[PDB]
Amino acid sequence: GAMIESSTTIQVISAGLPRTGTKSLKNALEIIYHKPCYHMFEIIFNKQSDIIKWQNLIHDSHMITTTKTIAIYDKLKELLDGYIATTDLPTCGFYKDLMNIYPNAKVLLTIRDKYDWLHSLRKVVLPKSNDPWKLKIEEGDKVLGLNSDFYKLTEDSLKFAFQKDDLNFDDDQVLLECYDEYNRLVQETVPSDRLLVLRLGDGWEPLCKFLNVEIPNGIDYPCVNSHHQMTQLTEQLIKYKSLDAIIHMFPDLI
């Protein structure tokens, strides 16, 4: 196809929850658009200074209906300046607001089997409080410079996505119910013409068709960020005590 000059603004809003192929999708969108896509990894590896800003936004987000709405929307736009898409926490819970701010953006929902999702979440993002692996995650997190404010953001952005005032994070049934309800609500809320639902394994074709772009030539659809790979990353951070000592060992993930 012909090369055209794409606008550096949010063109794709992905409402999918963590552990549903968001990092692969981030990578895929960057391959298509040649500009950055937001993701939790953007915060962890590039913009830890954003943590307090997302926290403040979530804090004020109950006021979203107006005057207050504009201030909140201004802060969201600021956070996303220079990006062409959003994926993952903390952004995904803001999908409705993002649709208002970026009326010409299309919306994606990444989904998968709910028990596979939960298993993956428990290994990487939200281990049970009595799981010994939680201590290893915390040790690796310290190597990356992530502290309690990072955990607060993770929890608060999950609660915001699930529209809960509090949440028993150690309760699998609660998390599964929230997952199902969240995915159902996205599909009820977003007009179908504006939504593409992507199941893990769908690859380039439906995505590129939805976005009116050619499938990237000779490039396989990304497959990164398995829980196994994250377990290796955690162990290597603990072993070497820095990111820069091992970053070359994780080329597409980081």
Ligand X SMILES: Nc1ncnc2c1ncn2[C@@H]1O[C@H](COP(=O)(O)O)[C@@H](OP(=O)(O)O)[C@H]1O
Q: Which residues bind ligand X (CB under 6 A)?
A: 18-24, 116, 120, 200-201, 221, 223, 225-227
* 229 phi, psi to nearest 5 deg: -65, -40
Shortest-Cβ-distance residue relative to ligand OAQ: 140
Q: Which stretch binds ligand OAQ (CB under 6 A): 51-59, 136-144, 202-210, 245-253?
A: 136-144
CB-based contacts of 113: which residues, under 8 Å, 6+ apart?
A: none
Separation between Cα atoms, residue 33 and residue 239, nearest integer Å: 36
Work out how close the CB of 241 gets to ligand OAQ at its nearest, in angstroms, rounded to a whole number.
Answer: 12
Question: How far apart are CB 125 and ligand OAQ at their closest, in Å?
Answer: 4
For ligand OAQ, the closer CB: 10 or 158: 158
Taking the complex as a whole, the smallest distance from the CB of residue 53 to ligand X amounts, in Å, to 22
Q: Which of 89, 109, 190, 243 binds ligand OAQ (CB under 6 A)?
A: 89
140 binds, among ligand OAQ, ligand X, none (CB under 5 to 8 A by kind): ligand OAQ
Distance CA 154, CA 18 (A): 10
Q: How far is the CB of 182 from ligand OAQ (least distance, A)?
A: 13
Judged by CB under 6 A, the chain residues 232 through 251 that form the site for ligand OAQ are 233-234, 237
Binding mask 152-191 for ligand OAQ (x = CB under 6 A): --x-------------------------------------
CA distance 96 to 107: 10
Question: Taking the complex as a whole, how short is the minimal distance between the CB of residue 68 and ligand X, in angstroms?
Answer: 31
Q: Which of 16, 21, 93, 140 binds ligand OAQ (CB under 6 A)?
A: 140
Q: End-to-end CA distance of the chain, in Å?
A: 30
Residue 106 contact partner, candidates ligand X, ligand OAQ, none, CB within 5 to 8 A by sort of partner:
none
Beta strands in the chain (DSSP E): 12-14, 37-38, 85-86, 106-111, 195-199
State the pairing for strand pair 106-111/85-86. Answer: unpaired
Q: 151, exposed or middle or buried, with CB in 10 Å at 0-12, 13-18, 19+?
A: middle
User: If binding is defined by CB under 6 A, does position 215 make contact with ligand OAQ?
Assistant: no
H or E element that contains 116: helix 114-124
Give the footprint of ligand OAQ on residues 11-30 (CB under 6 A).
18
Structure tokens at 197: 């639902």
Sheet with 106-111, edge to edge strand ranges: 37-38, 85-86, 12-14, 106-111, 195-199
Q: Which residues bind ligand OAQ (CB under 6 A)?
A: 18, 40, 88-89, 124-125, 137, 140-141, 144, 154, 230, 233-234, 237
